[model samples]
Target: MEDTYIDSLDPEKLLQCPYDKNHQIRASRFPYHLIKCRKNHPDVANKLATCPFNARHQVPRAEISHHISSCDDKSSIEQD
Candidate 1:
């Protein structure tokens, strides 16, 4: 038996859409997937909330409350 580091595992299994369980994408590809998923996923709100700091970021209506406060893009904007 051996212990493996988290990052050592396959990226495809690590990065998955939080909104859609069926969708799985590579870690490096998640940003692109996020853009597309927010557009095509039926479960998402018809009017996705664009992150205030980044126009490309689209979040579900319900999760907006949490997304705004914790969004890395928002943090990036504030830093600059």
Candidate 2:
């Protein structure tokens, strides 16, 4: 409960699914999409990096980074 907290929306950013190029999803719903499609896309998972904010939000190690600041789990928190 704060003074500058008022909004209504879902993620509009599109994310490429690691499973296959056939699947793409919004950042907000990627969590469910991941669990639903746990068939055989862990090929690169062995080198996945977990996010400090979201343990489930894994991404490339050197190329990409972890889940913090503006992560969905962080409720849209960003810093400079």
Candidate 3:
């Protein structure tokens, strides 16, 4: 039989920041880091807001309030 390939992952492993790969953060620490990172990085701060319900749906961060206020899936479950 061919050798089976499996990748092992640690539940407590640190994850890379979405905005800055150099920043490694734990799963529980990402939210806090994301907020701080965005505020500090104009590049990230200027990017569109990713819909909480749909990662693919992006809108201007400035318009995020209005977007979420009318998003079709705003009240729906978020997609991973």
Candidate 4:
């Protein structure tokens, strides 16, 4: 299997899900809410949709691309 590496500006990388103790990094600054993480499966998009972390579980990445594009949230591109 492969991996995905989403980047962020947050020093602590505090915006993603902590599952597997995965490092969480907010895709952007405040008033710009987004949690980016390493999703290494086809269901990656699904996890983001049902992930109830910060507060609201987001809709699947594919389910709402228009909304998450600015942050480049959903990428098929895998990483470390």
Candidate 5:
């Protein structure tokens, strides 16, 4: 079984920043790293937000609902 965390994760997986689609960083640590990274990328700061299905799956506010509906991480969150 796996634990479902609402926030925070380990720095093991590499996350591809939306802006730097080619760039990767410790995904589990994307929250913190993204905070700083996004600061440098003001264009999408407010545009981007955390994903309830998966923190690693960051997307813009516009697509948040769509993401949740199709999010794979919902396996745990919406599981019976």
Candidate 6:
């Protein structure tokens, strides 16, 4: 029998971001890190509100920082 390929995984491999693997910083050591962390991991909205990098890709960092400071999410660190 001739060998056959199932599918191409190269696209998936190439699209992956290394930073997507885990928290960029040690959350235990720096709980504040959670503020800038992606919401999908934990506190998505709050994190997005304060993310260092542009989350919505339109809002300015300074504005987003101020927005997160008072936005009530109750844990701001809990897993979403």
User: lDDT winner among the candidates?
Assistant: 3
Task: Tell me how candidate 5 scores on lDDT.
Answer: 0.69
lDDT for every model? 0.70, 0.61, 0.75, 0.42, 0.69, 0.40
Give the per-residue lDDT of model 1 (tens digit) for 1-80. 35564544553555878768988887778888988887776548355788886776676677667778788546534334
Q: Show the colliding residue pairs in model 2.
A: none
What lDDT, from 0 to 1, does candidate 3 have?
0.75
* Per-residue lDDT of model 3, residues 1-80, tens digit only: 35586444567678898887899998878889989999887745888888886786686687677767677656533364
Rank by TM-score, highest first: 3, 5, 1, 2, 4, 6
Q: Among all windows of ten consecutive residues in candidate 2, which has the lowest summed lDDT?
A: 61-70
For candidate 6, write residues 40-73 as lDDT tens digits. 4443443334343333332234455654653344
Task: Give the Cα error of residue 6 in candidate 3, in Å.
Answer: 26
Model 5, position 24, has a per-residue lDDT of 82
Q: What local lDDT score does residue 39 receive in model 2, on the 0 to 100 scale?
A: 40
Show how many residue pairs clash in every candidate, following the order shown: 0, 0, 0, 4, 0, 1
TM-score of each prediction: 0.37, 0.37, 0.43, 0.21, 0.39, 0.19
- Estimate, for each residue in 10-65, the C-alpha lDDT of model 4 and write its tens digit: 46445544443454444344223222333443345365553322224355556545
Model 2, span 21-45: residue lDDT tens: 7888887788888876654554354
Candidate 2 Cα outliers beyond 4 Å, as residue runs: 1-11, 40-80
Better model by TM-score: candidate 4 vs candidate 5:
5
Clashing pairs in 1: none
Indicate the TM-score of model 1: 0.37
Question: Model 2: how far is 1 from its true place, Å?
Answer: 8.3
What candidate 1 gets wrong by more than 4 Å, as runs, is 1-13, 42-80
Worst 10 residues of 1 by lDDT: 5-14
- On lDDT, the stronger of 2 and 5 is 5
Candidates 4 and 5 compared by lDDT, better number? 5
Q: Which regions of candidate 5 are displaced past 4 Å?
A: 1-11, 48-80
RMSD of 2: 16.0
State model 6's lDDT: 0.40
